Design an enzyme around this catalytic site. Structure first.
Site, PDB file in Angstrom:
ATOM      1  N   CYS B 272      28.057  24.260   4.119  1.00  0.00           N
ATOM      2  CA  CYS B 272      27.430  25.497   3.647  1.00  0.00           C
ATOM      3  C   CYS B 272      26.034  25.901   4.150  1.00  0.00           C
ATOM      4  CB  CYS B 272      27.503  25.604   2.113  1.00  0.00           C
ATOM      5  SG  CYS B 272      26.496  24.478   1.169  1.00  0.00           S
ATOM      6  N   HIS B 330      25.461  24.636  -3.459  1.00  0.00           N
ATOM      7  CA  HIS B 330      26.130  25.446  -2.456  1.00  0.00           C
ATOM      8  C   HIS B 330      25.119  26.464  -1.962  1.00  0.00           C
ATOM      9  CE1 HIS B 330      28.807  27.782  -0.136  1.00  0.00           C
ATOM     10  NE2 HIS B 330      28.993  28.750  -1.017  1.00  0.00           N
ATOM     11  N   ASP B 353      28.403  35.379   1.989  1.00  0.00           N
ATOM     12  CA  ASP B 353      28.691  33.953   2.157  1.00  0.00           C
ATOM     13  C   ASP B 353      29.691  33.685   3.272  1.00  0.00           C
ATOM     14  OD1 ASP B 353      29.097  31.205   1.837  1.00  0.00           O
ATOM     15  OD2 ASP B 353      29.301  31.334  -0.352  1.00  0.00           O
TER      16      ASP B 353
END
Ligand SMILES: CCCCCCCCO[C@@H]1[C@@H](O)[C@H](O)[C@@H](CO)O[C@H]1O
Ligand SMILES: CCCCCCCCO[C@@H]1[C@@H](O)[C@H](O)[C@@H](CO)O[C@H]1O
Ligand SMILES: [Ca+2]
Ligand SMILES: [Ca+2]
Ligand SMILES: [Ca+2]
Ligand SMILES: [Ca+2]
Ligand SMILES: [Ca+2]
Ligand SMILES: [Ca+2]
Ligand SMILES: [Cl-]
Ligand SMILES: [Cl-]
Lengths: 673, 673
Positions: B272, B330, B353
């Protein structure tokens, strides 16, 4: 529980004593490179078989192992020669460790840290700091000085003597180096972190601090405020408004502390011996054996031709015409160290001069210059040899110059007048040690003439007269001289004599005409005649400076013959100033002292200030205001001193007033205990 | 002769400075929409009153006037809002023209041609090309950001900070966005010509590039290699053969260039923060203000019920059961732009994202999602709000599951543990800025539960125990914890305690059991007991991953009472790695730097590689092979960096070896002009 440090015993008294650094008033751990020191490290447990201690020392803002400004060494028996640590013994959780440093380590302030490898982890803690200096006691150190007596004088002595005056009357003033006085060591060390070199490249500068040649040259630059916000601001004008008369100072202490206290602004003002005394303090404080040198008839050759010119006009007036000059005397320093850059025959005393006379690579710096090299004329070697060789052995040409006709004409050349009675304080006493023969071959020998030619090669009358002093010469009394002339021809001669007297600064700066006179004489063959020169106090007092110097000149001319110039620089003594101890002197025991001064003038003296100091006798400088003192009256000032270190000490005092600036007095005192 | 262009001066330096695009290393003309630029056009003759000039701009493979991907405008005043050209001055045959573009023009590479009507005929010539980006400086541009400091941080800053770790100890890693490095802008622009949207319909794609919501959503898909031959291939397995450990990367530069250098093959591998750092680079290069957000205890709700399940068996083992999962943290991004599709209250930061967790429209893409809308629970709004709302605010259910009996039972429900310390780098410094308050109402407040129900509505023990850390936690050292238990009952109770220790990837992926233990205790009323948990280096070293994380669990059971589950994730620190510059830093002046690393293990570390980079300090990435390093030994590596841009820069390093993957170091350096 992981291995760790609980505390460390630096055994400062023990180590400083062994390292000959116990005299500094500091409480810091002061050491000298290349010599072991012992520490006790109390751990929280016993050194484990699978644990490891790594010592880390570093100096400067950019420590690196490659530059030698950082070293990491394990606690492991044996000496690597450079940095090392040996476990001498283990008692409980206390480790007796001997730490070693290389003889070529950079000097300065260091930080020591401990890296610990224990239980699969690593920890790091700062142990503390210490100061590392040059080591005159260590045979392999470049500043090594084997003889005990000399090392004590050139490194451990904080009271000195600097010779001054003129070649006709050599005098001396006491000087308090005070390298051991509170904060002096710290300030001298901080000078290196303020230089042009350090600001240009701090990493490189700090690494170069392992070299006395480098440290010496830096200090010869930083002691003068020129170019770098250095310590002392020079002034040879005769007028010292906005500061102190260069002659009132009695030591390096007040100078350095004032420099720091003023946020590093120039200290006003100084002249050559002030620069030298201050530089000497710095050098000795850092561990470089050094002494102060006085050269009379010191020449400033700005031409690079080993020749300096002096001028006079037909009326007998000295002229400030050439860029070069000859000083009644000039003071500088000599540091002691080998010269790896020059070779094995050039080690020993090295000239260092903080007085801003000649720019070197653009800045006012001077030295180090091998004295041995100077004597042989090897002026191609670093540093600044041409200039220094010139100061001690340049030829002197006298010229006659008439501005009205713009005509200039050579009169004579003197090849032996410059560089006489080069002096320095004897080891263990105040006697004068003449080192002229160390700077050059004997005047009048074929050798000094061969050397002169060698050095230069690398860079490229019926009437005789004399000025004689008659009777005492002292400020307040009239000056009496006699011009003695003689006719050496077989023919009667008529000589026209033009004379003058000028008050001057010791470097030759002309201040003012105080007397002048002309006369014509009839001299038969072999006849000797004399013309008296009388200058009253009333005539010279107004333009006489603290130098108490007067330049007397007589230009004599006979028809069809070149002028005969008769020269003479005279120095008037100051009235006596006395210091007296009123009892036996013992450490930590107050002793009453008294200053005595009698006014010899017909008028009172005012604005009287008495300045007193002396390392080991008084903390800092004592200033005492003395009321106006009537004519022929006596001033008696009493004060108490408190000895702090036993031995032969030196008390200095300065007494300045409107009619008598900087009258000096010194008293040797034996402090027992 | 007919009118024609002799040459054109794009005044690149002047226009780029005005358009705030001067930092890109490119030589090209980089401009921002809605702002005019000036060019000098030297013609072959004067502009006749009967002649005419038409400018023509075009972008894409199918330039269309109705799509705004092509525009033709006359060299005549009257800014028609969109594209226009104004003749400001005429000197000789040189025309000073000012060109304006519309605030809503599509971004990208444009070609500019000129049509000339002269002497009854028409000629046409290409003038050149330029790049047009979003304009955060233009009040009417949708990406407008009015505050200077914020715009400088979110658009012009190429050095960043990404927060990681756990809720028990938040760490941070430096990241080199490098949007201004050679070819980076170009590569980021090329990504748009490589998307699924472009391949599907290039004409409509390019026309849609005037919309930051569109560009943003596209990039959230193309930054990951999934579905479209995107940039990064994710990997959360703990084994990264055939690529680089996701934690070894230091920036987006090496990644984007590698992607291009390999003919657009996936770059292996990312996690991530790597996707986010790279997306952030693209967003800033194209002109969309953006920053990186880190959410701790991030939930992945695949059921769309705003609830996630975590499972444990009776023996205290965490289980990999259920579609969902809870990440220790995250990372993602936020872009700044108005939301014309949602209304006046949803503009501002928008979630984007690139990490491929949940498919959207069958593609691994995510956002834009109005942060303000997420806080309010307006999850019916585009895009991907259900998923994002769950990441920061889903409820957590802890279950017990025994596979042997096939039985499953609830243990507890937690509504505050998910979505904590949502963080982003502070403007102008590396301080952590907590933005939890922007994503949701206070945990525990009535509002937070009101919005939770609102969002869900739119979609549809005598024993207490605690795990505590005893001592430091570092890779190489043993792990020491203690399970603290206490019986709050009035009667004596017997408790059976089953415990385990599992190494894990930061996302919850279970790697391997490194320790387990069971014990039965009898505790009297109010009695407190402690059970030591000790895991040695040998035990876990084999299964610990670069994450350096271990999951400790304790399931405590008392007859007739429900199980008490005690959870605790721990992070072991890597040994230290430091960087030190050995001097001041100035533009174009090479300066040496030293890397310091010490091996704390009883074995040596091999395959040592030092990776170093930093925009404005080094061109690209420096790679240094370090020789094997024995146990307890220190590695001393030196290298030079070359400052090319003044200001506060960021140097980053990664040191990887067989026993220690991805040790990180960061050093802030002030570069003078
Ligand atoms: C040749 C005769 C003159 C030399 C010696 C004279 C006797 C005393 O010598 C005098 C000192 O008394 C005088 O104060 C200083 C200052 O310049 O100069 C000396 O030459
Ligand atoms: C109740 C125990 C937490 C209170 C703090 C105790 C001091 C040390 O705290 C530890 C750190 O040293 C450790 O590396 C990290 C990693 O997860 O976890 C912390 O809880
Ligand atoms: Ca200076
Ligand atoms: Ca000369
Ligand atoms: Ca001579
Ligand atoms: Ca993709
Ligand atoms: Ca769910
Ligand atoms: Ca909640
Ligand atoms: Cl000190
Ligand atoms: Cl580019």
């Amino acid at each position: 529980a992981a291995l760790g440090v609980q505390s460390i015993n630096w055994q400062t008294a023990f180590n400083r004593q062994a390292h000959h650094t116990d005299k500094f008033s500091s409480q810091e751990l002061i050491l000298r490179r290349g010599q072991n020191f012992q520490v006790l490290m109390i751990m929280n447990k016993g050194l484990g078989s699978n644990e490891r201690l790594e010592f880390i020392v570093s100096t400067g803002p950019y420590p690196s192992e490659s530059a030698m400004t950082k070293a990491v060494f394990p606690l492991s028996n044996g000496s690597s020669g450079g940095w090392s640590a040996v476990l001498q013994a283990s008692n409980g959780n206390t480790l007796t460790i001997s730490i070693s440093s290389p003889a070529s380590a950079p000097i300065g302030r260091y930080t020591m840290a401990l890296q610990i490898f224990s239980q699969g982890g690593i920890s790091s803690v700062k142990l503390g700091t210490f100061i590392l200096l040059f080591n005159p006691w260590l045979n392999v150190d470049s500043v090594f000085m084997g003889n005990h007596a000399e090392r004590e004088e050139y490194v451990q002595e904080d009271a000195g003597i600097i010779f001054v005056g003129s070649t006709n009357r050599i005098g001396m003033i006491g000087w308090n180096f005070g390298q051991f006085e509170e904060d002096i060591l710290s300030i001298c060390l901080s000078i290196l972190d303020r230089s042009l070199n350090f600001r240009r490249d701090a990493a490189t500068d700090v690494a170069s601090r392992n070299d006395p040649k480098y440290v010496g040259r830096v200090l010869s630059a930083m002691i003068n405020s020129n170019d770098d916000n250095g310590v002392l601001a020079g002034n040879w004008s005769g007028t010292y408004t906005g500061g102190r008369d260069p002659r009132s100072w009695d030591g390096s202490v007040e100078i350095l502390k004032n420099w720091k206290k003023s946020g590093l602004s120039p200290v006003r003002y100084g002249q050559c011996w002030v620069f030298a005394g201050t530089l000497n303090t710095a050098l000795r404080s850092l561990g470089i054996p050094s002494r102060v040198i006085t050269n009379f008839n010191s020449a400033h050759d700005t031409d690079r031709n080993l020749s300096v010119d002096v001028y006079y006009d037909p009326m007998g007036n000295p002229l400030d015409k050439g860029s070069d000059s000859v000083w009644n005397f000039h003071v500088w320093n000599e540091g002691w160290f080998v010269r790896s850059d020059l070779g094995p025959s050039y080690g020993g005393w090295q000239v260092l001069d903080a007085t801003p006379q000649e720019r070197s690579q653009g800045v006012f710096q001077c030295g180090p210059a091998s004295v041995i090299g100077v004597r042989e004329g090897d002026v191609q070697l670093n540093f600044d040899m041409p200039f220094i060789f010139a100061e001690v052995n340049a030829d002197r040409i006298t010229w006659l110059y008439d501005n009205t006709t713009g005509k200039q004409w050579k009169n004579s050349v003197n090849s032996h007048t410059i560089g006489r009675y080069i002096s320095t304080k004897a080891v263990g006493s105040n006697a004068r040690m003449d080192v002229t023969d160390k700077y050059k071959y004997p005047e009048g020998s074929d050798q000094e003439r061969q050397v002169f030619q060698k050095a230069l090669g690398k860079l490229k009358p019926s009437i005789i007269g004399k000025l004689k002093v008659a009777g005492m010469l002292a400020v307040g009394k009239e000056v009496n001289l006699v011009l003695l002339l003689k006719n050496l021809s077989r023919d009667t001669k008529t000589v026209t004599v033009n004379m003058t007297a000028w008050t001057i600064i010791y470097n030759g700066t002309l201040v003012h005409e105080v007397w002048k006179d002309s006369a014509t004489m009839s001299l038969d063959p072999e006849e000797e005649a004399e013309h008296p020169i009388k200058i009253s106090y009333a005539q010279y007092e107004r333009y006489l400076k603290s130098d108490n110097m007067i330049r007397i000149t007589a230009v004599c001319k006979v028809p069809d013959e070149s002028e005969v110039v008769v020269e003479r620089d005279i120095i008037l003594d100051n009235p006596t100033l006395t210091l007296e101890v009123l009892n036996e002197a013992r450490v930590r025991k107050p002793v009453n002292v008294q200053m005595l001064f009698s006014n010899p003038l017909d008028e009172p003296v005012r604005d009287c200030v008495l300045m007193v100091e002396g390392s080991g006798l008084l903390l800092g400088n004592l200033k005492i205001d003395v009321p106006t003192l009537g004519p022929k009256e006596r001033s008696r000032v009493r004060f108490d001193i408190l000895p702090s270190r036993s031995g032969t000490k030196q008390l200095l005092a300065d007494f300045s007033c409107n009619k008598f600036p900087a009258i000096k007095a010194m008293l040797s005192i034996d402090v027992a205990e």
